[PDB]
Design a binder for these strands. Structure first.
Lengths: 88, 173
RNA sequence: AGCUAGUUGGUGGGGUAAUGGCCCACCAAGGCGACGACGGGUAGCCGGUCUGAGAGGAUGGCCGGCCACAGGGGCACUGA
RNA sequence: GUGGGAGAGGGUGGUGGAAUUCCCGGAGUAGCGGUGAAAUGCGCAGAUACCGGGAGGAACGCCGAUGGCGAAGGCAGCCACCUGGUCCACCCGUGACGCUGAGGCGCGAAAGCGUGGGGAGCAAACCGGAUUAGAUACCCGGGUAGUCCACGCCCUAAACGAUGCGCGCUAGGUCUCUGGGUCUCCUGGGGGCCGAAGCUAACGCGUUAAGCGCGCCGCCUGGGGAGUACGGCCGCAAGGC
RNA sequence: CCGAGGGUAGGGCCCGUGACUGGGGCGAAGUCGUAACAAGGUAGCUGUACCGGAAGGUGCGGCUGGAUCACCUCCUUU
RNA sequence: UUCUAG
RNA sequence: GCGAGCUAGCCCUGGCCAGGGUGAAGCUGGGGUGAGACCCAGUGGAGGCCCGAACCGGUGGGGGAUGCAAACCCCUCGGAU
RNA sequence: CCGCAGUGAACAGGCUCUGGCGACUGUUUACCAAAAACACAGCUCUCUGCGAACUCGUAAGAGGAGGUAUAGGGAGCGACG
RNA sequence: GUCCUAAGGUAGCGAAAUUCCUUGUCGGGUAAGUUCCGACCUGCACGAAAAGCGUAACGACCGGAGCGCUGUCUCGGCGAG
């Protein structure tokens, strides 16, 4: 599972400003991290269709947050994608 | 390649290291070279599992460590095995790639119980051995001999059949 | 539910009152479609006309405009 | 964000009695079992009942509830492993990032199919017994596919609350669960019941709206033939859109 | 060279159309039966599966648009 | 258990 | 008693199939989704697979019937890693 | 550019429409018959725990099989649906 | 409504190569069609396991039809070895 101090090292990593506990930078970082150890969980455990559907909601939650930053500032969006590595 | 090899351990204290994946064509068994301590080897049983990186053996002692094998005496209850050690040392006493081995489903005095892989049940005896672990035969079943006749390719008798014949030919025939 | 070889564009050029793949050469391949393309069914389009409290339904023969056809199917001449 | 909290949401592994039917031993008789009354059936080669032992699936009593979770179907002996949703408090952080959704895309009862285990019990089909006029059904005695699991396929239904989703406005009394508080009660969610306004053709809904208003969706528009025929897509097929 | 027309071949959209046959609707009324509304007599309806002169029945799932106290466990409250 | 239509 | 230098088999051990055609697993790259399913394009080269010589055969017709021959000649045909 | 002809000669499928059986490449009755006959990949019952069961054998013994119930033998059909 | 039997043919098929009464009766194909092919089906005597209905591809298998083409035939008539 996700450790509490792991969560903070991620929040510290993505923050532009000391105190960024909640922002586009954190949401996507959280959701993408939550996407890579939930999908990892579904490969074994092939039939966890209740938690797969709850993942897919979160998959759509990511994209719409991503959508917003391109809608406003696509400059830091290219900086946010590359750093994470999503889109292909 | 038209040959046999191993089938029954009885020299122990020996270091059992899972030789390798020499999946083998000659008895429905798929075995890998088992590297012993001295260096003496053996294309050993195919009791599925025990990864390349060998790492096993047996012993008068114990070590259920899947695969591996000792006497009946030295064996759990509710256990699945093969290396069917029927009589006292008769080496293997059954289960050839016959995956579903036997399951010491209850033992008794100089007599240990066995679920007859094949399809029945009764008892063995004392020291009598047998190594747990699965088989190896990937359901060595099925698989299509399509527009041809694997058979032939058998090298394995088209000893073909008949039954209808024109005659009155061969035993009970 | 796919549609396309003159088909989409370009260079040069024939022809025409002259634009235009309009016809041709050579070149690159695009052009289109659910904001319904291709196909099928049916059709003279309107001013006006009948009806309708109305919005909206129908309809557009004679009078008028533009257009089409001259038994069916084409082509050229003379020529503003 | 953080900090708590609840739950039969899920899926992987694992263990726990209770009993059920079969199997070996003990004991011990003459009857059992069965209905509306019988009969078929079992049993003197000793059954039914009791004792003890075994093996095996399959559920999972009490707690358990008019209660709970969940997107829909649907989900309950304990165990831990991954994991989803969802709820109070701090008001910290982003800064309108939104609400609906043709098609798609995924799920998704139970029946069924495909292959590969397994099958204690239940049980269409089929088999006897009864039955009546007739018994292809109710009732009784048997018993197979299935029901069980892995994996892949179907996706249908009184799939129900017969009633899209979102936000916002319009008295209350009352039962219960969850989260917080100055915890005779106030607070936010959630569940049952009564009931003012109001809607209604009718019942009845009634801040869990069938009230009042805003978005965007799907569906209506006479009864049978029909939800069928034909063309099209889909399934191994039964069918299905 | 382009082309009106004519030919042989190949397909596509459709109307006609046929021994025969599936069903569907009429029609005075015919036979055989009870399925259904009162538990329609076994409450009914449904997805589906098998079977049965025919309505239907039995099984797995379920929905009540199922209801009485002719019986049990209790519940819920002054 | 069954007993047409007006 | 006699025989697989007949022929049907079976064991052991060598040799042999001129050319050509079709283009599955794979691996490379690109393709809307989370990874994928899965699509396409390239490469690729299987199959008792196709077209056919030698070689194996011996339907379908022709000749031959004191034949060339106690099964052969002619046209034809199937198989062809 | 030429002839009636331009794989010029020579080696080189007639195609189609339909039905029945067996699926299919096959294999076989040497000197008539290559077929809807056997063979099959594939199904189902099934005897067998080993020193197997069946086959040769006067007793050894071989076979089976250095196989071991995803196996070995007995079989009626002979994809797949 | 019954008499006997252990029950007393079910789903698919049908004059099939199991149907002699028969060139059965209707339909199509034709200038006529006792072969076909479709349909009925009183199945002289199909039927699920020596399977049953069908089935793409597949066959020197068997039977039915159309175009193409030729002395196969309307008698041929000439010629070469």
């Amino acid at each position: 599972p996700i450790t509490k101090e792991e969560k903070q090292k991620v929040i510290q990593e993505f923050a532009r400003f000391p105190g960024d506990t909640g922002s586009t930078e954190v949401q996507v970082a959280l959701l993408t991290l939550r996407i890579n150890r939930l999908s990892e969980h579904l490969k074994v455990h092939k039939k966890d269709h209740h938690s797969h559907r709850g993942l897919l909601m979160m998959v759509g939650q990511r994209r719409r947050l991503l959508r917003y930053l391109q809608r406003e500032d696509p400059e830091r969006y290219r900086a946010l994608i590359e750093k994470l590595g999503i889109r292909g | 390649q038209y040959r046999i090899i191993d089938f029954k351990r009885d020299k122990d204290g020996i270091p059992g290291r899972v030789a390798t994946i020499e999946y083998d064509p000659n008895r429905s068994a798929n075995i890998a070279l088992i590297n012993y301590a001295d260096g003496e080897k053996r294309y050993i049983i195919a009791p599925k599992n025990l990864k390349v990186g060998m790492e096993i053996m047996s012993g008068p002692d114990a070590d259920i460590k899947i695969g591996n094998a000792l006497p009946l005496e030295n064996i759990p209850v509710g256990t699945l095995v093969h290396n069917i050690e029927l009589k006292p040392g008769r080496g293997g006493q059954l289960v050839r790639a016959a995956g579903t081995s036997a399951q010491v489903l209850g033992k008794e005095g100089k007599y240990v119980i066995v679920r007859l892989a094949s399809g029945e049940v009764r008892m063995i005896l004392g020291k009598c051995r047998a190594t747990v672990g699965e088989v190896g035969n990937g359901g060595r079943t099925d698989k299509p001999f399509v527009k041809a006749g694997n058979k032939h390719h058998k090298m394995k008798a088209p000893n073909v059949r008949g039954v209808a014949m024109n005659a009155v030919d061969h035993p009970f025939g």
